Design an enzyme around this catalytic site. Structure first.
Site, short mmCIF file in Angstrom:
data_model
loop_
_atom_site.label_atom_id
_atom_site.label_comp_id
_atom_site.label_asym_id
_atom_site.label_seq_id
_atom_site.Cartn_x
_atom_site.Cartn_y
_atom_site.Cartn_z
N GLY B 16 0.81 -1.22 0.00
CA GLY B 16 0.00 0.00 0.00
C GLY B 16 0.84 1.27 0.00
O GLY B 16 2.03 1.25 -0.30
N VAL B 23 4.64 1.33 1.06
CA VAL B 23 4.80 0.17 1.96
C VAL B 23 4.94 -1.10 1.12
O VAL B 23 4.08 -1.38 0.30
CB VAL B 23 3.65 0.06 2.97
CG1 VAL B 23 3.90 -1.07 3.97
CG2 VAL B 23 3.47 1.35 3.77
N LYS B 38 8.46 0.29 5.32
CA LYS B 38 7.99 1.65 4.99
C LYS B 38 9.16 2.40 4.40
O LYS B 38 10.20 2.51 5.04
CB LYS B 38 7.48 2.37 6.25
CG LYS B 38 6.34 1.64 6.98
CD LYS B 38 5.97 2.28 8.33
CE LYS B 38 5.47 3.72 8.20
NZ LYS B 38 4.90 4.21 9.48
N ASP B 136 -4.78 9.98 16.73
CA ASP B 136 -5.33 9.58 15.44
C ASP B 136 -5.92 8.16 15.46
O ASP B 136 -5.75 7.40 14.51
CB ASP B 136 -4.25 9.79 14.36
CG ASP B 136 -4.81 9.97 12.94
OD1 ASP B 136 -5.91 10.55 12.79
OD2 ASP B 136 -4.12 9.60 11.97
#
Ligand SMILES: Nc1ncnc2c1ncn2[C@@H]1O[C@H](COP(=O)(O)OP(=O)(O)O)[C@@H](O)[C@H]1O
Lengths: 306, 307, 328
Positions: B16, B23, B38, B136
């Site tokens: 993704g 990623v 990442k 978050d």
């Protein structure tokens, strides 16, 4: 007999092996209060991270939950200075691997392999009934006593399938500290996907061990781990080396042993037989004499430690 | 098509894209363990507001946190010639938002939603005991392992309390607008950090059980005007035990809003919920349609021929 | 087929034969076989079989007859009389009935709050090597429930754990330490309330673990002290603990231990004494008397540990804080 948890009671005599990462030393010893000979396993805990110390404590819990004739009994466990000391009875022939590396370099006899693998499957049938998956069934983890009894010993690697009181259908933990074990692990353990694995994963490692005892070298020996992963994933299955499969090619194994190794090593885990189903297999019906009468004679080229 | 090695890791295909970069799947070539990476182009980090400081902070927090419900950092690797950084992470199959996007009602059965909410509250109680405020919390930042264990992931927006401060008072407004409390929408100078995360876990439980949002608006100003009014509704198919829990969370005044203690003590939390309906499965791989989401590395192993 | 009320009456009577064994072995073997067979018959009601899952009516009748008969107290009291595989069946039966729910109620926790001796007979089992591992499994399942964890913490029997974590049999001593850590860390508000009201007695025992001659007792006890002090539920304990000159004098000795692991764990507790705002004068007197020795030592302390960036920031901050000290 009961063994005292004090470091002064044991005279260490010689080194008989090494293990863990490279941190464990295995010693033959004499227990001073009686003159009995024992194995002492020592690990320096200053060399261990907090994860490694926690991984060593799990072996001591599992080795207390099992009581079976074909699993190694632990006699004592204690700390001496920096070192975790574990004591067991001493297995006078060593491991099945020590015999191959010294007296059976081109592989063992089929009847000796039958006695050994029957003892291994009897220990796995108990462990699978207790709700555990053994991991690392390999010829280094099979030990033989002077009276010909066979013991399975890889208990550090074991995983419970029980979670929150429920026996789970499959598990997903990838085995820690396992670099030396990768050839014997099954494809469904290495895939690390949404399928998981169960107790049928040991029936593969028994097939890899059967090839190792028969051929004298493990499948996938010289390969980098990434090439062996590729050959497992592309579906390459190892088999017995005799004059039907092709210097040592002046032999045949029985069709029963060829069929046994092909019931193990199947790609679909659900097609593999259970450990209690394999103990009925026609390969073992060539065993006529008692193990404690036959195995010392089948090993006649060897000298036991006494 | 072609293999690339980065330290001991073999590069696989794309999993993704995050807030700071791509990623990818990777394989540890020594131990065969399956991981995620990442990829952080230093050229891009200096284009994002405080991005280089957020990446440094995220690494310093992840090096000192250890829990069953918080993501694990495995390695940080550098390539100063190509101006790149790599964070190697524990592998997770998908986020909770990818499952919610995969069903037409965008919700879970009450028995499945309760099983994730208990794991969220176990992870938040750890983070709050360590002095970390995760600003978050939402279904996009909750990840699932192959064993069905939930992981709280994106620590880049978080704030860490000073060791000798007697309370969780916070200054700075940050994170996803639709999950923020009235204290943020009204632009107050100081608020309790731990009581912000209870609101965001409340909007999360409302969303995953109901398939809706409590507050909506076409832009950030209209959205914060609607959150600042404090007024919302709960649908008619919502059960009385859940409706009361969703009113103790989602409460306008921080002193009246529930603590983690009052959440764990609530009737809907302590009840056992029957499997009355089939659970939502993890969806099949989006390109290849593989239901098991198996490793992408095989055509890279067939280029490298081992090593 | 036999009912739960038949099976509870069978196991009750066969246990009452094993209780005395005045008759010769010809009766004791029959009684031992009956106890084994009836423990499997109970476990089949609770866990079922692959073709026949547990039935909720049979579990309800079994769980009620196990309260009515007092047999849960009897199986825990007489656990030494049972054979090896049977002792694991008692632990598997006990844990399943302890997790029973009726809506929001847990009726087995409501039961054990009377006849509380079950909790103390499980805790006493660490003194008996042939039952200690099964008692440890059952006791760790009890302390998941806050009323049962509270009965153990607030009791004179709790201070036996300071003997059990120092036993020479390491597989028992490490199981006792796992149970001891779970009581102190699972229920945050209950643990903080205990550590305030019992401060003077608890830390007077805990300092003896930090002086232990066993390496693994010393290592695990110093790890846990740092985790108890950094937890934000314990802030009133932490600020009181770091206000004592005896507690700093100990941490400056542990920084000079032969174990790299003991030195590194002691640094992460020592850091909190120097980083503290509003120090009391006994702490300032200690650090002023040691100013040059500490600066020279912290400039040399584990400089080969180059992989960690925050460790070097903390060492730099401590050397600055020790230079910035003002004379009286
Ligand atoms: N009790 C024993 N008796 C005889 N040999 C033993 C015994 N225990 C271990 N060994 C020898 O030591 C080797 C290493 O021990 P092992 O248990 O296999 O270590 P590890 O699992 O850590 O790799 C064995 O393969 C065998 O050669």
């Amino acid at each position: 007999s009961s063994f005292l948890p004090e470091g002064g009671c044991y005279e260490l005599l010689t080194v008989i092996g090494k293990g863990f990462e490279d941190l464990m030393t295995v010693n033959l010893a004499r227990y001073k209060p009686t003159g009995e000979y024992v194995t002492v396993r020592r690990i320096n805990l200053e060399a261990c991270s907090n994860e490694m110390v926690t991984f060593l404590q799990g072996e001591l819990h599992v080795s207390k939950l099992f009581n079976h004739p074909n699993i190694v009994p632990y006699r004592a466990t204690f700390i001496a200075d920096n070192e975790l000391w574990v004591v067991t009875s001493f297995m006078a022939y060593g491991s099945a691997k020590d015999l191959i590396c010294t007296h059976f370099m081109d592989g063992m006899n089929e009847l000796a392999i039958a006695y050994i693998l029957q003892g291994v499957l009897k220990a796995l049938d108990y462990i699978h009934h207790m709700g555990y998956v053994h991991r690392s069934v390999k010829a280094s983890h099979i030990l033989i006593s002077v009276d010909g009894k066979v013991y399975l010993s890889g208990l550090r690697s074991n995983l419970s399938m029980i979670s929150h009181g429920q026996r789970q259908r499959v598990v997903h933990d990838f085995p820690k500290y396992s670099v030396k074990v990768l050839p014997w692990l099954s494809p469904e353990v290495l895939q690390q996907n949404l399928q998981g694995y169960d107790a049928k994963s040991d029936i593969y490692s028994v097939g890899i061990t059967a090839c190792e005892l028969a051929n004298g070298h493990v499948p996938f020996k010289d390969m980098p781990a990434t090439q062996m992963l590729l050959e497992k994933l592309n579906g390459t299955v190892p088999c017995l080396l005799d004059t039907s499969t092709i210097h040592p090619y002046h032999r045949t194994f029985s069709p029963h042993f060829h069929h046994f190794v092909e019931q193990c090593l199947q790609r679909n885990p659900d097609a593999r037989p259970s450990a209690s189903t394999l103990l009925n297999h026609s390969f073992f019906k060539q065993i006529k004499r008692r193990a404690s009468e036959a195995l010392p004679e089948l090993l006649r080229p060897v000298t036991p430690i006494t | 098509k072609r293999a690339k090695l980065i330290g001991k890791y073999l590069m696989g295909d794309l999993l993704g894209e995050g807030s700071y970069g791509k990623v990818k799947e990777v394989l540890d070539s020594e131990t065969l363990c399956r991981r995620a990476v990442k990829i952080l182009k230093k050229k891009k980090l200096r284009r994002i507001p405080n991005g280089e400081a957020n990446v440094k902070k995220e690494i310093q927090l992840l090096r000192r946190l250890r829990h069953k419900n918080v993501i694990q950092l495995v390695d940080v690797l550098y390539n100063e010639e190509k101006q790149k950084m790599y964070m190697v992470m524990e592998y997770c199959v998908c986020g909770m938002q990818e499952m919610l996007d995969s069903v037409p009602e965008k919700r879970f059965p009450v028995c499945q939603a309760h099983g994730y909410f208990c794991q969220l509250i176990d992870g938040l109680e750890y983070l709050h005991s360590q002095g970390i405020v995760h600003k978050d919390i939402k279904p996009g930042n909750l990840l699932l392992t192959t064993g069905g264990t939930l992981k709280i992931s994106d620590l880049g927006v978080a704030e860490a309390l000073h060791p000798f401060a007697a309370d969780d008072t916070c200054r700075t407004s940050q994170g996803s607008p639709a999950f923020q409390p009235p204290e943020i929408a009204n632009g107050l100078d100081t608020f309790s950090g731990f009581k912000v995360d209870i609101w965001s876990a409340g909007v999360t439980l409302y969303n995953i059980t109901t398939g809706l949002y409590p507050f909506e608006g076409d832009n950030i100003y209209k959205l914060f005007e609607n959150i600042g009014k404090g007024s919302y509704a709960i649908p008619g198919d919502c059960g009385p035990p859940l409706s009361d829990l969703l009113k103790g969370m989602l409460e306008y005044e921080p002193a009246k809003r529930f603590s983690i203690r009052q959440i764990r003590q609530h009737s809907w939390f302590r009840k056992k919920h029957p499997p009355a309906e089939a659970p939502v499965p993890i969806p099949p791989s989006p390109d290849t349609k593989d239901r098991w989401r198996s490793m992408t590395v095989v055509p890279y192993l067939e280029d490298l021929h081992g090593a | 087929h036999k009912s739960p009320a038949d099976i509870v009456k069978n196991l009750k009577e066969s246990m009452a034969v094993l209780e005395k064994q005045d008759i010769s072995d010809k009766k004791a073997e029959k009684a031992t076989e009956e106890v084994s067979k009836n423990l499997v018959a109970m476990k089949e009601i609770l866990y079922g079989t692959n073709e026949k899952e547990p039935q909720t009516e049979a579990v309800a009748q079994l769980a009620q007859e196990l309260y009515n008969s007092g047999l849960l107290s009897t199986l825990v009291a007489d656990l030494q009389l049972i054979d090896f595989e049977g002792k694991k069946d008692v632990a598997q039966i006990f844990n399943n009935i302890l997790r029973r729910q009726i809506g929001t109620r847990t009726p087995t926790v409501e039961y054990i709050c009377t006849q509380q001796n079950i909790l103390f007979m499980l805790l006493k089992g660490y003194e008996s090597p042939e039952i200690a591992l099964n008692c440890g499994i059952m006791l760790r399942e009890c302390i998941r429930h806050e009323p049962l964890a509270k009965i153990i913490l607030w009791s004179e029997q709790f201070y036996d754990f300071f003997r059990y974590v120092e036993m020479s049999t390491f597989d028992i001593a490490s199981d006792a330490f796992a149970t001891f850590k779970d009581l102190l860390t699972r229920h945050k508000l209950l643990s903080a309330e205990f550590l305030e009201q019992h401060y003077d007695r608890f830390f007077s025992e805990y300092e003896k673990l930090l002086h232990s001659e066993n390496y693994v007792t010393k290592r695990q006890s110093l790890k846990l002290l740092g985790e108890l002090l950094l937890d934000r539920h314990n802030f009133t304990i932490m600020t009181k603990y770091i206000s004592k000159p005896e507690n700093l004098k100990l941490m400056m000795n542990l920084l000079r231990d032969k174990s790299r692991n003991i030195q590194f764990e002691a640094f992460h507790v020592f850091k909190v004494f120097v980083a503290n705002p509003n120090k009391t004068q006994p702490i300032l007197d200690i650090l002023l008397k040691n100013q040059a020795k500490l600066i020279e030592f912290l400039s040399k302390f584990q400089n080969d540990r180059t992989e960690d960036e925050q460790f070097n920031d903390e060492k730099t901050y401590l050397v600055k804080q020790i230079r910035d000290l003002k004379r009286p």
